[PDB]
Amino acid sequence: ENYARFITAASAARNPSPIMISLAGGLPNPNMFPFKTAVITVENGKTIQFGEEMMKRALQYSPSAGIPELLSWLKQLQIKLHNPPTIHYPPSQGQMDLCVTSGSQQGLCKVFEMIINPGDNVLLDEPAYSGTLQSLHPLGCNIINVASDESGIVPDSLRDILSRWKPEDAKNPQKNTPKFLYTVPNGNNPTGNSLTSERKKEIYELARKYDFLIIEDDPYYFLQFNKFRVPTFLSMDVDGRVIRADSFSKIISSGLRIGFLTGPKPLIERVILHIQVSTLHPSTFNQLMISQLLHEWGEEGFMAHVDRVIDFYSNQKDAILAAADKWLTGLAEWHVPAAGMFLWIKVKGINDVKELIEEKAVKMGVLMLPGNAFYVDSSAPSPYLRASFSSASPEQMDVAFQVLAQLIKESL
Amino acid sequence: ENYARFITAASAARNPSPIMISLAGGLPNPNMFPFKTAVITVENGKTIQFGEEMMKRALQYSPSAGIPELLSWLKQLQIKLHNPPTIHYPPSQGQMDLCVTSGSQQGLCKVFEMIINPGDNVLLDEPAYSGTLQSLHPLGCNIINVASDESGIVPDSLRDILSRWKPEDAKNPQKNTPKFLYTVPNGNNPTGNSLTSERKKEIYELARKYDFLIIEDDPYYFLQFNKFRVPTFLSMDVDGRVIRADSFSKIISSGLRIGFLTGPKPLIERVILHIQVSTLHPSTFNQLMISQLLHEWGEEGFMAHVDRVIDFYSNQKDAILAAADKWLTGLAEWHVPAAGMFLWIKVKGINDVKELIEEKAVKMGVLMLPGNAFYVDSSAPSPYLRASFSSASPEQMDVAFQVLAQLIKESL
Numbered sequence: 001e002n003y004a005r006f007i008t009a010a011s012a013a014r015n016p017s018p019i020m021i022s023l024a025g026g027l028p029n030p031n032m033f034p035f036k037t038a039v040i041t042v043e044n045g046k047t048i049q050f051g052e053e054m055m056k057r058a059l060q061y062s063p064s065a066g067i068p069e070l071l072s073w074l075k076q077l078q079i080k081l082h083n084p085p086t087i088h089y090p091p092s093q094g095q096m097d098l099c100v101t102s103g104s105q106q107g108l109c110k111v112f113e114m115i116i117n118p119g120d121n122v123l124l125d126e127p128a129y130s131g132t133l134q135s136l137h138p139l140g141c142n143i144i145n146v147a148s149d150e151s152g153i154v155p156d157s158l159r160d161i162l163s164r165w166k167p168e169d170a171k172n173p174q175k176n177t178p179k180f181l182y183t184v185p186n187g188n189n190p191t192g193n194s195l196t197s198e199r200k201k202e203i204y205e206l207a208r209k210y211d212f213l214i215i216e217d218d219p220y221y222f223l224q225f226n227k228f229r230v231p232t233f234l235s236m237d238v239d240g241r242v243i244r245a246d247s248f249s250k251i252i253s254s255g256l257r258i259g260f261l262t263g264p265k266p267l268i269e270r271v272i273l274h275i276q277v278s279t280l281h282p283s284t285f286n287q288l289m290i291s292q293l294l295h296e297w298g299e300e301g302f303m304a305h306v307d308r309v310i311d312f313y314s315n316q317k318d319a320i321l322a323a324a325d326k327w328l329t330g331l332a333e334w335h336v337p338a339a340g341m342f343l344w345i346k347v348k349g350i351n352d353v354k355e356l357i358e359e360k361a362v363k364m365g366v367l368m369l370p371g372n373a374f375y376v377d378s379s380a381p382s383p384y385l386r387a388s389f390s391s392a393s394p395e396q397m398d399v400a401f402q403v404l405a406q407l408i409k410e411s412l
Numbered sequence: 413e414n415y416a417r418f419i420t421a422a423s424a425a426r427n428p429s430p431i432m433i434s435l436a437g438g439l440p441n442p443n444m445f446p447f448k449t450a451v452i453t454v455e456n457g458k459t460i461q462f463g464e465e466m467m468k469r470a471l472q473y474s475p476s477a478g479i480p481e482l483l484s485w486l487k488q489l490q491i492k493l494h495n496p497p498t499i500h501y502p503p504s505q506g507q508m509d510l511c512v513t514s515g516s517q518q519g520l521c522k523v524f525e526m527i528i529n530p531g532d533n534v535l536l537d538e539p540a541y542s543g544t545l546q547s548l549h550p551l552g553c554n555i556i557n558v559a560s561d562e563s564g565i566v567p568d569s570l571r572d573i574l575s576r577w578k579p580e581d582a583k584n585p586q587k588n589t590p591k592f593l594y595t596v597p598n599g600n601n602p603t604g605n606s607l608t609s610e611r612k613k614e615i616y617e618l619a620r621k622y623d624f625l626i627i628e629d630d631p632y633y634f635l636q637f638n639k640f641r642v643p644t645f646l647s648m649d650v651d652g653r654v655i656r657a658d659s660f661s662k663i664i665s666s667g668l669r670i671g672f673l674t675g676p677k678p679l680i681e682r683v684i685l686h687i688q689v690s691t692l693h694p695s696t697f698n699q700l701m702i703s704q705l706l707h708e709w710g711e712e713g714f715m716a717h718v719d720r721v722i723d724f725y726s727n728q729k730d731a732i733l734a735a736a737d738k739w740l741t742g743l744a745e746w747h748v749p750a751a752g753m754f755l756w757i758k759v760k761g762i763n764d765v766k767e768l769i770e771e772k773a774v775k776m777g778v779l780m781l782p783g784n785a786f787y788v789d790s791s792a793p794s795p796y797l798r799a800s801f802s803s804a805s806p807e808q809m810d811v812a813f814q815v816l817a818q819l820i821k822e823s824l
């Protein structure tokens with residue numbers, strides 16, 4: 001717990017800038033900006049108002065890690081939900097820290113870039129989010145698939161993958177033990193599957209034994225259909241080995257590009273220093289919109305909002321499941337998603353569905369997404385389809401599945 | 413040209429993503445988003461309204477390269493202002509293209525990352541923007557400093573540096589010829605100096621002869637006090653070797669994080685692929701704000717706005733020079749700024765200004781910035797101070813230079 005062995009020479013080289021009447025600053029005059037006030041309504045909520053001075057702040061440069069009121073609020077959220085062991089540690093031993101990012105993707109991308117040298121080994125479970133595979137591809141790592149099933153990563157397959165390395169080689173710089181394990185523990189995209197609490201503990205003990213980081217990409221954390229959320233990897237992180245990406249895109253707004261990253265201070269500080277020379281900071285304006293909403297909501301309002309969105313997505317899930325039962329019984333296999341917005345469907349008797357969907361189905365005015373995109377080798381044939389239930393009506397799902405069943409029959 | 417010479421292994425490896433009733437999409441339902449309408453007022457202009465449908469768009473994911481209306485408007489802007497030779501070249505030659513970025517610093521950071529292998533040579537004039545120095549340092553390039561004066565880079569210094577290679581070394585992959593020249597041609601930060609039209613021609617000829625890219629970082633372009641703007645490198649780009657970064661930060665809003673990158677289509681494509689796996693897209697809400705303003709203003713509003721802001725900063729410039737003349741003529745030297753928001757002051761007495769500006773000027777009442785931050789070797793002593801004239805009244809300035817004027821007189 002220095003973290004040096006985890007990171008690249010470029011990342012380690014990064015330095016903070018060498019930076020009443022102030023003539024020392026580089027702020028444009030915000031009085032020159034054309035936008036003067038703003039009012040944003042909130043459904044059954046307090047309107048967000050930027051008066052004259054607040055608008056000038058919204059339209060001006062702000063701190064790289066995020067605005068202070070949003071960072072304190074998010075720190076208290078993390079403490080209440082996850083009580084990470086790491087809040088009481090010194091900085092060097094991995095004290096809990098946070099930064100607002102321009103979506104959770106930015107956080108992840110910056111973390112991957114911080115850590116990966118050409119040839120490094122990284123573990124994850126395929127099928128995996130494609131934006132992650134596309135981020136990892138040009139970095140030259142070996143991606144090693146860990147087996148999974150309806151309950152996520154199978155600790156026993158991780159265990160036997162890891163048995164090719166020696167635990168004592170972890171801190172040897174000339175031995176290529178894995179740098180991290182990446183997973184989406186709730187509502188994995190594309191499969192819909194979630195990790196159980198017993199599996200998490202087992203995986204955490206492995207990460208400690210072989211001494212690698214866990215990158216917990218958890219954008220569907222607040223979209224769990226049975227409304228009991230099991231402990232996160234961050235909540236059990238006695239070692240300071242977890243970096244966690246949370247997203248507001250699925251519950252508050254995707255277009256505002258605001259997410260946040262939580263983890264060991266030294267690693268968060270590397271990410272912040274990279275952000276500082278790229279985007280500089282997240283939109284000051286969008287941070288304030290969100291900070292205002294959250295502060296006025298408090299616990300009462302936030303819980304109520306997330307309950308309503310969970311209730312919406314589980315009605316949708318019940319609908320797509322009804323439609324799959326009606327049309328696809330005996331033609332395909334699927335598990336009930338625990339969270340998220342996707343159903344993952346294995347078509348029986350066909351080796352690759354990409355012919356059938358990317359071509360035949362679209363003539364019929366319907367498309368779902370073939371599973372090839374979610375593998376490291378997307379050229380391999382895949383019998384799977386991802387179907388989203390975020391938007392389609394009960395009626396649209398029915399026709400969509402009616403059409404798919406037709407195609408599967410004709411193809412056979 | 414083909415551009416492969418100037419692109420890293422990692423950047424060349426980037427691929428576009430893989431991925432009518434459609435269940436194929438990964439969009440969250442925007443009806444779940446809590447913000448519902450927005451009203452933004454514009455000084456002496458049309459109030460901007462986001463009604464319920466428009467708000468939904470503003471709060472949702474959008475294209476990586478930028479929203480189509482902002483793109484088409486920006487392209488017509490560049491054509492109108494710079495009429496670049498490359499608009500009708502085939503893609504592989506440098507066909508002009510453009511993408512919106514999350515500030516102009518994101519554009520520059522991604523261009524540097526796309527190009528630099530450790531050990532590469534890049535050319536630039538010091539003192540230079542601290543943010544580009546901080547971005548370049550971790551990439552492990554050799555920064556070769558090119559000499560400059562009140563008219564910017566001196567071509568003859570550039571000619572001498574380039575004499576260490578033969579013109580024919582450029583396409584020889586075994587020779588480490590420079591990848592690019594970086595400069596800020598108008599109101600350099602910190603110096604306030606600008607390039608003349610005559611030097612730009614001589615510099616472009618050297619870039620052609622030794623075949624390197626020019627990166628035109630031009631955030632202060634619309635802030636030219638000499639209310640006739642000098643032709644840009646982009647406007648003379650017969651070879652498709654220029655990448656230009658423009659910013660709305662000084663004229664519209666720094667906190668909204670909206671800038672644009674213009675240059676050869678194959679390089680623009682490499683930058684868009686990198687943004688797809690990091691920020692995904694610039695905030696859709698902030699793009700819509702800007703694009704409504706710009707389309708409502710048209711060209712009469714837009715040039716009327718810049719005229720008004722030039723006039724403001726021009727007055728601030730006169731005020732600060734009048735204050736530098738009144739209290740400083742003798743103790744320090746300075747050039748008159750051609751554009752931007754900074755005055756660069758050489759204090760004549762001492763080797764390092766950090767003595768009397770940090771410990772001794774903070775314990776007075778004024779702040780200026782030690783010139784140390786703007787050199788590759790920021791530890792080396794600097795007699796220079798950067799003073800901004802964006803904000804402070806004639807009043808405050810008068811006192812600020814009064815205080816400084818005394819502080820100088822005590823250490824002599």
Ligand SMILES: Cc1ncc(COP(=O)(O)O)c(CNN2CCN(C3=C(F)CC4=C(O)C(C(=O)[O-])=CN5C4=C3OC[C@@H]5C)CC2)c1O
Nearest residue numbers: 026027061062063064280515516517541596601659661671
């Ligand atoms: C020559 C040159 N080239 C590119 C850019 C980048 O412009 P964008 O289009 O906005 O990406 C610039 C502009 N450089 N500015 C200099 C000023 N700088 C910062 C401030 F003015 C203020 C500031 C704060 O107040 C602050 C805080 O509240 O803690 C933090 N920071 C601030 C600045 O940058 C560092 C951090 C984020 C912004 C960039 C250019 O001149």
Ligand SMILES: Cc1ncc(COP(=O)(O)O)c(CNN2CCN(C3=C(F)CC4=C(O)C(C(=O)[O-])=CN5C4=C3OC[C@@H]5C)CC2)c1O
Nearest residue numbers: 103104105129184189247249259438439473474475476692
């Ligand atoms: C498992 C997992 N992990 C992290 C993230 C990161 O999300 P953040 O929003 O950064 O917090 C995700 C989310 N993945 N989504 C998948 C879907 N994808 C895009 C769309 F859904 C829709 C979309 C459009 O409609 C669109 C347009 O209208 O032009 C453009 N684009 C769209 C997507 O991305 C590509 C471009 C921007 C975004 C990320 C996750 O699942």
